[PDB]
Design a protein around this ligand. Structure first.
Ligand code: F3S
Ligand code: F3S
Ligand SMILES: [Fe+3]
Ligand SMILES: [Fe+3]
Lengths: 532, 535
């Protein structure tokens, strides 16, 4: 006999476990009505603008408790490494600055993502996408965020949209008369660490699955600013469904799923394998970016049904800029998840490197120290990331020289957020180093980029280049964009390619900028043991 | 507020698919009623319409194809640049479609995962139980027709059982403007679903030389495991991995065919016909062909360029296979409308092999096969033992526990397959091959224990299988992938369940076949038919 079984059966489908605050006066935007014997809700679409604007404002300055608790755990655990505690303390101090509501917690203010669930009898006028986009537009235009979206004019010619649009707007049709939301400000680097694997029944045994988990976690590396919220999804009805599920799992959206399966194929959370993921993450030694125990805050594992011939697997993380906010509109008005507004309640040597010298003198100083040495940089940095590197490679391919500004100073891979009025800099933390790996040997062979400064582990070609050319890769702490801007960056100037927006080449003057020597000029790599 | 400009990512010029031919379900206007509430037009829809619609969609789609799919098979037959094997495979698939058009046998034994993309208007009122009513219609189609129950439930992380009804479905129901209900139904095979790939790339990819080299490298990794000729879809960019993968799926269904062909400063999606031509050139010059060498690796290509976060460049690659099964539909004030597929595929048909007797000692069959090079076409006559993913896993588990390889794995060639349900009065339901590569990890082990010397399935296999067959005097025979109905109708003469009946279509079967075509893909000498094109 026919029995309908929804794949996802949360015990808390409306997220009653979350605390919400009502937007004052927002009941003027809604009206409960009764039509053809059923209860319905008229929603002024301006409510969607108001809600999206506040969601994408609040989320850049505050965090959830389970995120902040993880940083406290890394500081207080006796088994945490010194580097575990240093990174966690830095990230918590960064959250305190961001809670001042001026600087966003990260320079990568992310892609704006909206999961919306509009009830059958929730009536907005139907222009939901436009009104939500206006609210997102408002948040990024009138606050000190960043325009990160890149439009394709043709296959290869690109320009910044200049407003952080388009958003990802996933609006679902559901029962009832309410409007429920999950807003995500998703960083590009953590988005890049969403992986899809096409596996088989041969994986579905304890030995093979455990070895698989050990192998894939290492490929996450430190490139998305751990401690991670790690999500793993085994199975699914399609690749895109698997990847949607792992995204939502990483946002703890599916925390109230059942923990057992049944003959109808319902999804379930697997706490036993969540513990195994956490054990793998801790035993890996990767740590909170620079070696140790706190590779991961927590883990989510969801098992899904599958076609007999198929076994898609999804792996994804939420990064240090863990940014999601639940919301709903009902007959009483607009409700938005309440985040932690006082992160300070969770708070319980190094080599000085003078950059105001010839670069060869800086290289000589750095050559005296092994990888893992903590350094403090003082002086000028030249800032360049993906598009600038690509344009410079193209210039050299056309016979033009490597520009002088790539040869005078360490290269900081970064793209700043907008500068608050009266501030020297907006949030200005590092870009993932690995995306520039294909340029290092070329630029060094042409006399520049001997010293780079960014975050994340890099490929072997960069280790080989630095040894061949006498170069160095310095790893900044990943994530603390606001405290770096507040305490370290003293002057910012646009140097080249101003049309690239945040991806322009910048010249900045810094003081007390912390980093680790990750790759030296001798073939050594701080990550060679943990990420082998 | 003056500089704000809203731009939807997807701006099709034909959003309601007026270019598609639809048929009205007779009398279906009785399921809808136009009303007016708060000055706005709304449509009340009896949810039983959703059951009727889903039932007909997942019945029609298993027996008929779109014109653009059938035209590709005709092109492979009529093109002078097509190889002999290209024409042979395309002719076989067209003949298979003529059988499937009889509405008894489905076109493929893998009747797929049921996928529904639904777009419910703000003022389209169904009562809200859409997922249940759609699932009941899907349940009806798979229960009362000669399809297959393919969905595997997880009782725990590792303990599995077949759901016995091909549920659950993938139901993606979206909230959109208006008062109509629009649908795309997909019956998605597992093998083509497995060839949906996500790559996390960078700006370093986004130049003509790098992108062309990337396409050349990735298209080969598709191999022949999803029964080409493919509809190849490639998506460059996206706002998230899941959005990229959703887009590449819909692109492969030609859902986005009416997108613009140029970008703008607002980041709208666009189809790129120039790079679609490049994808087709790469696929043709690859020499992979329609499964067995030639030009027709691909029917056609779709390339969609998407906006991206500056730090990101997700890329999606996916195919629609020979069982190219999607059907558009909509409900409006006039009733239920369903896309009209081609009911006379025979009009696309236009106006050498070694006979292998399997009713011999297996060692004599091996001795005969050893006389021929890879690429030789054979015709099999006799008994096959049928086993795929779960049966192989269960047998390896038995052996790991000290038990012998069962005798029934040593007496006959092993056919990887899982049959659809048998029509009344028929010897067999649709019964084409499973992807060989998924069983690769068992071949050397089983051959070391005196069985699985000869396997029969579809797709290229990994090097460990070539090494095993050379070490153990084995062979891998490649069936044509896709023609499950003509194989059932013409070649499969008897089917009996031998072991593991609780596995449903994944049980071990003993079947008797006649005139079953295949190619020698791997021989007993280290040779592989795909070693040049898929290197
Ligand atoms: S968005 Fe996340 S990956 Fe790092 S650069 Fe910002 S914390
Ligand atoms: S569903 Fe498609 S991949 Fe082959 S086995 Fe059937 S034609
Ligand atoms: Fe990255
Ligand atoms: Fe497969």
């Amino acid at each position: 006999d026919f029995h309908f079984s929804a794949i996802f059966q949360p015990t808390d489908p409306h997220h009653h476990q979350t605390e919400f605050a009502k937007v004052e006066g927002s009941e003027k935007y809604v009206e409960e009505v009764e039509v053809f014997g059923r209860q319905a809700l008229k929603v002024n679409p301006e409510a969607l603008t108001i809600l999206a604007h506040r969601a994408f404002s609040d989320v850049h300055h505050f965090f959830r408790k389970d995120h902040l608790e993880g940083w406290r755990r890394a500081i207080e655990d006796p088994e945490a490494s010194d580097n575990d505690r240093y990174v966690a303390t830095t990230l918590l101090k960064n959250a305190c600055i961001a809670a001042g509501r001026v600087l966003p917690s990260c320079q990568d203010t992310g892609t704006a993502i909206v999961l919306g669930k509009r009830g059958e009898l929730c009536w907005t006028g139907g222009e939901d996408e436009k009104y939500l986009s206006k609210g997102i537009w408002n948040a990024y235009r009138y606050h000190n965020l960043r325009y990160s979206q890149t439009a394709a004019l043709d296959m290869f010619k690109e320009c910044n949209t200049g407003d952080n649009l388009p958003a990802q707007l996933d609006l679902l049709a559901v029962p009832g008369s309410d409007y429920e939301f999950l807003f995500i400000a998703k960083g590009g680097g953590s988005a890049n660490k969403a992986y899809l694997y096409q596996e088989t029944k041969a994986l579905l045994n304890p030995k093979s699955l455990r070895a698989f988990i050990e192998e894939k976690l290492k490929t996450l590396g430190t490139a998305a600013c751990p401690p991670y919220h790690i999500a793993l999804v085994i199975g699914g009805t399609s690749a895109e469904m698997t990847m949607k599920t792992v995204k939502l799992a990483s946002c703890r959206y599916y925390d109230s799923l059942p923990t057992t399966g049944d003959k109808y194929g319902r999804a379930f959370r697997d706490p036993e394998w969540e513990k195994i993921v956490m054990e793998v993450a801790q035993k890996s030694g990767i740590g909170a970016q620079f070696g140790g125990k706190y590779f991961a805050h927590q883990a989510r594992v969801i098992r899904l049904p599958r076609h007999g011939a198929s076994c898609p697997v999804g792996l994804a993380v939420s990064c240090s800029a863990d940014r999601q906010i639940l919301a709903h509109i009902n007959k009483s008005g607009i409700y938005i998840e309440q985040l932690e507004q006082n992160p300070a309640q969770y708070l319980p040597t190094s080599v000085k490197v003078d950059l105001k010298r010839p670069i060869d003198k800086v290289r000589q100083q750095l050559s005296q120290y092994p990888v893992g040495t903590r350094v403090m940089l003082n002086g000028t940095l030249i800032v360049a990331r993906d598009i600038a590197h690509a344009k410079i490679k193209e210039m050299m391919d056309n016979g033009e020289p490597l520009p002088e500004y790539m040869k005078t100073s360490p290269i900081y891979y970064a793209g700043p957020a907008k500068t608050p009025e009266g501030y020297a800099s907006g949030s200005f933390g590092p870009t993932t180093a690995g995306r520039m790996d294909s340029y290092v040997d070329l630029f060094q062979s042409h006399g520049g980029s001997y010293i780079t400064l960014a975050k994340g582990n890099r490929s072997k070609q960069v280790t080989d280049a630095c040894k061949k050319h006498g170069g160095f890769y310095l790893g900044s702490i990943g994530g603390p964009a606001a405290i770096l801007a507040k305490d370290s960056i003293k002057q910012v100037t646009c140097l080249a390619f101003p049309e690239l927006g945040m991806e322009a080449v910048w010249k900045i003057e810094v003081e007390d900028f912390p980093a680790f020597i990750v790759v030296d000029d001798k073939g050594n790599d701080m990550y060679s043991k943990t990420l082998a």
